């Protein structure tokens, strides 16, 4: 029912970090694969060297969980956002807050910086999202309409520029400038938390308890229903070679190929020493810039780092 | 954002000049009814005339389709009291502030989801014409209105001077409509007979061009007719209709309008 | 009557309105108002109620069904059609809606509009039961070509050998043994060596048995078991018993 | 958020996060799993952790 799926070598766990004192809610990578940022519910924000796996820095911004961060590739800025109703921006030469965009009403849940228009787009459990001027603390649009907490946003240059998925189980595509709803999709049954945009196929996938779904831009054409990783899914991350990663809620991490939707690996990770298994979980993922290694921030205060498997061949690992 | 790129006004509020210069100021003022910021149009209704504006939300102009700068029915030129009372339309647009503003914004959402040409709601559903409305209608352009409000100023004892715009729109206490409604109540109409058994229609002035053929041809629309007796002696035609409801409909229909071959023949109760 | 019933009307109107006022929730009070005013046969008032509750919650199928059934009872065919199309436009998966709607098409008698609605419906590829309601409809009139075209699109939208076997049984029932032999041949062609299984080839052996071609029955049975997956134990045994039946009978 | 409402706030955020997560995943008690009762059991589990 499909052309024979390609062969991607599996992934093996090799390096494990344990430095936080709470859940690790979000994690991002620096433009040049030298260091990655972590934001936790311990309220810290910790910068780590990507090579030596050593904690380069820690900074005590928030008042509660840091629910999401993002590093600027057009500046030495780093934007944090947390359930303290507030969003902050750090200069990373002087390591300090430089402006704070007030305005939301409840816990921010996630955010993204638009690659070319210098704005932020942040989603919040207050049933909205907003578009922020970078510098001047100006919000141009309250992208509104989701009947509940806008569980995530991703933004991109092309039309449409803003996709937001929610606990209303809907997905919504917005025109940025008029700040208006353009299109809705409502295929899902259970809330939808993870949306990811392909780098070179003008497409995007959304995850929910039921299973992943795939769509074609700019319209919202359903494509290809991906099933198999039946667990509350928390982040989707896609790689250069079409490797697509779904981190589930309960630790079970699943891999597939983007083209055929071929679930070709299940990794089922082991918790730290002191953590009961029931505290297992995955909360965010990110491939490095060079896309060789993979970071995953788990729900037991640890950051696990997987590497492409080098000893893999078609016979070591056949495709079926 | 209430935004009109067109004005909703009859020729009466428009002005006599076929070439009108009109400026628009968006959100220049809130709706006096809706409290909604809408585009106000400013244009000179004539040389030596008042340079007027459009002041209502397109909600308010659309729902009751009163010429926004005339507040007059764009089809009837008539005040809201006379219009609604002639279409028997008791328009219960709520009086309270919350209900008024919210319902005006709601009829505005309904206007934007309607073609914007025909009214959104119940009054735009009673397009059943009124003969008394035709009687009250003024088909001439009241350009002298377009002048400003050097003459003896409006007398305070005449109940028209103090102009009540809000109630005169929302359906209460229109003085000019009350006067014209007294006029259209005292206007000539066919009173029904106390003697119930005669379906006896007299036609006075039927003339030499109308024969019994064309007479019954006009009489056909209202119901069965038993007998016809024309007298060129009195230029009259006495028709006995078979039905009482038929004769009543024929009476109200042909009273003061029926023109058979150009001339109005007096439809009267028989004697 | 004149005023004593008007009193009753004001009272209970305000009671219903006050109840749904305090609540704004469950359409129990809504629907009871709908029936209050349909028993008063104020159809426009009850319809306004219906639309107000539609705005309250546009997602109640029994609410839409109350609407439609009231329209059927008070004969407002065009408005019932309006309601029907609105629903099915809004909830393409509520097959109660398509079912009762095409039922309405049959009641009004317009088999043409029945066909059209069934057509718009099959676009959602609803389900085997939907195609089969479609085919029972199409077979309340003869329409044999339409019948087999329904079957042909159906067994491809739901490409199940069992659906194909229903197609084959319908072919036999309507005496198209030519097209039915072609049904089974094309069916094994499509299903291919990869995944095909017992029931199809036992069915082919049995059809050819009824055609009295025992030699071809046996070439079918053995050649198929050799070409495809064979074995496991209960399948081999039952197939061998059906082959014994094909031989003897 | 200010040191006064830190506790009440974080509590609100926690209870609601629980509601979202499970009582959108665990159902198939679809009507309402008596979430309110599952949250009563939450509170009781806490109490008992506090009292060992």
């Amino acid at each position: 029912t499909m052309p024979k799926p390609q062969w991607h070598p599996p992934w093996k766990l090799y390096r494990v970090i344990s430095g936080h004192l709470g859940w690790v809610r979000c994690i991002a990578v620096e433009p040049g694969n030298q260091w990655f940022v972590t934001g936790s519910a311990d309220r810290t924000i910790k910068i780590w060297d990507l090579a030596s796996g050593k904690l380069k820095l820690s900074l005590t911004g928030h008042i509660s969980t840091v629910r999401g961060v993002i590093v600027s590739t057009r500046s030495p800025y780093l934007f944090s956002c947390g359930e303290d109703k507030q969003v902050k921006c750090w200069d990373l030469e002087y390591n300090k807050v430089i402006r704070h965009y007030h305005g939301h009403l409840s816990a921010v849940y996630g955010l993204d910086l638009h690659p070319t228009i210098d704005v932020l787009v942040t989603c919040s459990r207050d049933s909205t999202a907003r578009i922020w001027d970078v510098r001047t603390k100006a919000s141009v649009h309250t992208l509104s309409g989701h009947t509940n907490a806008v569980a995530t946003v991703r933004c991109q240059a092309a039309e449409p520029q803003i996709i937001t998925g929610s606990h209303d189980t809907t997905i919504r595509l917005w025109d940025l400038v008029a700040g208006k709803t353009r299109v809705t999709l409502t295929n899902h049954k259970k809330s939808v938390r993870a949306v990811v945009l392909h780098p070179r196929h003008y497409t995007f996938a959304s995850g929910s308890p039921d299973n992943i779904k795939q769509w074609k831009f700019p319209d919202g054409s359903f494509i290809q229903n991906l099933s198999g990783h039946n667990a509350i899914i928390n982040t989707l991350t896609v790689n250069s070679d079409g490797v697509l990663v779904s981190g589930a809620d309960n630790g079970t991490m699943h891999l597939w190929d983007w083209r055929t939707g071929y679930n070709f690996q299940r990794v089922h990770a082991a918790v730290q020493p002191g953590s009961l298994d029931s505290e297992s979980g995955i909360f965010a993922c990110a491939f490095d810039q060079s896309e060789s290694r993979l970071l995953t921030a788990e729900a037991d205060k640890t950051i696990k780092v997987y590497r492409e498997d080098d000893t893999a061949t078609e016979e070591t690992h056949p495709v079926s | 954002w209430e935004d009109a790129d067109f004005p909703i006004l009859c020729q009466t509020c428009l002005g006599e000049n076929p070439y009108i210069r009109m400026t628009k100021e968006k959100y220049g003022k809130e709706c006096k009814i809706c409290a909604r910021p809408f585009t106000v149009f400013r244009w000179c209704p004539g040389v030596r005339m008042r340079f007027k504006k459009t002041e209502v939300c397109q909600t308010c102009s659309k729902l009751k389709n009163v010429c926004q700068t005339c507040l007059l029915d764009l089809e009837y030129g008539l005040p809201i009291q006379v219009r609604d009372a002639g279409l028997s339309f008791k328009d219960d647009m709520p009086k309270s502030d919350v209900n008024k503003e919210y319902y005006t914004q709601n009829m505005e959402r309904e206007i934007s989801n309607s073609d914007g040409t025909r009214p959104v709601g119940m009054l735009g559903k009673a397009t059943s014409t009124s003969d008394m409305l035709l009687k009250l209608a003024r088909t001439t352009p009241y350009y002298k209105r377009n002048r400003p409000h050097h003459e003896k100023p409006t007398d305070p004892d005449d109940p028209l001077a103090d102009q009540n715009i809000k109630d005169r729109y929302y359906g209460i206490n229109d003085p000019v409509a009350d006067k014209l409604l007294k006029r259209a109540s005292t206007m000539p109409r066919l009173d029904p007979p106390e003697d119930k058994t005669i379906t006896t229609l007299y036609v006075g002035g039927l003339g030499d061009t109308i024969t019994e053929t064309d007479l019954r041809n006009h009489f056909y629309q209202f119901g069965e007719i038993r007998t016809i007796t024309v007298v060129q002696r009195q230029q009259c035609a006495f028709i006995q209709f078979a039905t009482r409801q038929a004769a009543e409909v024929a009476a109200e229909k042909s009273f003061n309008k029926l023109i058979v071959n150009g001339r109005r023949l007096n439809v009267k109760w028989g004697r | 009557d004149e005023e004593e019933l008007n009193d009753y009307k004001l009272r209970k109107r305000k009671t219903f309105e006050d109840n749904i006022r305090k609540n704004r929730t469950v359409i129990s009070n809504w629907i009871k108002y709908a029936q209050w005013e349909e028993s008063l046969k104020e159809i426009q008032r009850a319809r306004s109620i219906y639309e107000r509750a539609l705005d309250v919650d546009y997602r109640n199928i029994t609410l839409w069904l109350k609407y439609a059934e009231m329209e059927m009872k008070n004969r407002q065919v065009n408005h019932a059609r309006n309601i029907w199309d609105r629903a099915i436009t809004t909830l393409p998966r509520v097959n109660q809606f398509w079912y009762k709607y095409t039922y309405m098409e049959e009641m009004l008698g317009n088999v043409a509009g029945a066909r059209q609605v069934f057509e718009r419906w099959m676009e959602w590829q609803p389900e085997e039961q939907a195609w089969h309601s479609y085919i029972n409809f199409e077979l309340r009139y003869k329409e044999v070509d339409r019948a087999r075209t329904i079957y042909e699109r159906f067994v491809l939208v739901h490409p199940d050998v069992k659906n194909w076997i229903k197609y084959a049984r319908f072919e036999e029932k309507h005496a198209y043994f030519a097209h039915a032999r072609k049904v089974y041949e094309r069916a094994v062609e499509f299903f291919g060596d990869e995944h095909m299984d017992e029931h199809l080839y036992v069915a082919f052996a049995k059809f050819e048995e009824n055609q009295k071609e025992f030699e071809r029955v046996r070439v079918i049975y053995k050649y198929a078991l050799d070409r495809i997956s064979k074995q496991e134990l209960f399948k081999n045994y039952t197939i061998f018993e059906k082959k014994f039946g094909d031989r003897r009978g | 958020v200010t040191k006064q409402r830190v506790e009440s706030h974080f509590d609100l955020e926690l209870r609601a996060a629980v509601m979202h997560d499970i009582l959108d995943m665990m159902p198939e008690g679809i009507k309402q799993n008596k979430a309110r009762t599952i949250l009563q059991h939450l509170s009781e589990a806490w109490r008992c952790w506090k009292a060992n």
């Binding site: 999709l185 409502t186 | 709601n106 | 436009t89 809004t90 909830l91 393409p92 | 198939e28 679809i30």
Partner: peptide, 23 residues
């Protein structure tokens, strides 16, 4: 009054057995 509700392009439910109905 917001924009009209888009059709709920949805799946059908598969009802609750006694097993998970008690589970």
């Amino acid at each position: 009054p917001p924009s009209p509700p888009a059709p709920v392009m949805h799946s059908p439910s598969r009802k609750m057995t006694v097993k998970e109905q008690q589970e």
